[PDB]
Amino acid sequence: SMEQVAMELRLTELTRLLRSVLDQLQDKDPARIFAQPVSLKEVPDYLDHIKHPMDFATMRKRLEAQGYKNLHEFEEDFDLIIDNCMKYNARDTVFYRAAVRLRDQGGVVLRQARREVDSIG
Ligand code: NA
């Protein structure tokens, strides 16, 4: 149906916009702290602590399968990246502090993406 096609074109355009968001967020992480999964071969106890690991590469795979149906879904995964880091790492560490900073700088990017998704429909 043409209705189905139109929904598919909307999902594609949302995907395009979330790609630009994901690239922008990732530029706020030049050290690449959040780029890849934590390796269970080097924080071997990680999964006893953190139930839903998340990272930018994992988000990118989901994005490329058009796996985010709305901005809220994409935001939830970004929030897992930050929140997991702030739980596993202590307040005094480079990792916790990098998560605070990414959250702060990511706020700006996400605030405008919400306006664009609402405005474009
Ligand atoms: Na903690």
- Which domains are seen in the chain, by residue range? 1-121 (1.20.920.10)
Cβ 68 vs Cβ 74: under 8 Å? yes
**Which CA distances in Å does 5 have to 1, 11, 12, 55, 107?**
6, 10, 11, 31, 33
- C-alpha 90 to ligand 1 mean position (Å): 5
The amino acid that residue 68 corresponds to is Y
- C-alpha 74 to ligand 1 mean position (Å): 24
- C-alpha 84 to ligand 1 mean position (Å): 9
Phi–psi pair at 63, nearest 5 degrees = -65, -45
- C-alpha 96 to ligand 1 mean position (Å): 9
Q: d(Cα 48, Cα 14) in Å, to the nearest integer?
A: 35
Please state, as a whole number, how many other Cβ atoms lie within 10 Å of the Cβ of residue 2.
Answer: 6
Q: d(Cα 3, Cα 9) in Å, to the nearest integer?
A: 10
- C-alpha 119 to ligand 1 mean position (Å): 38
Residue 59, token pair as written in the block: 């988000």
Long-range CB pairs of 45-51 (<8 Å, 24+ gap) are 46/88, 49/87, 49/88, 50/84, 50/87, 50/88
**Resolved by:** X-ray
Residues in the chain: 121
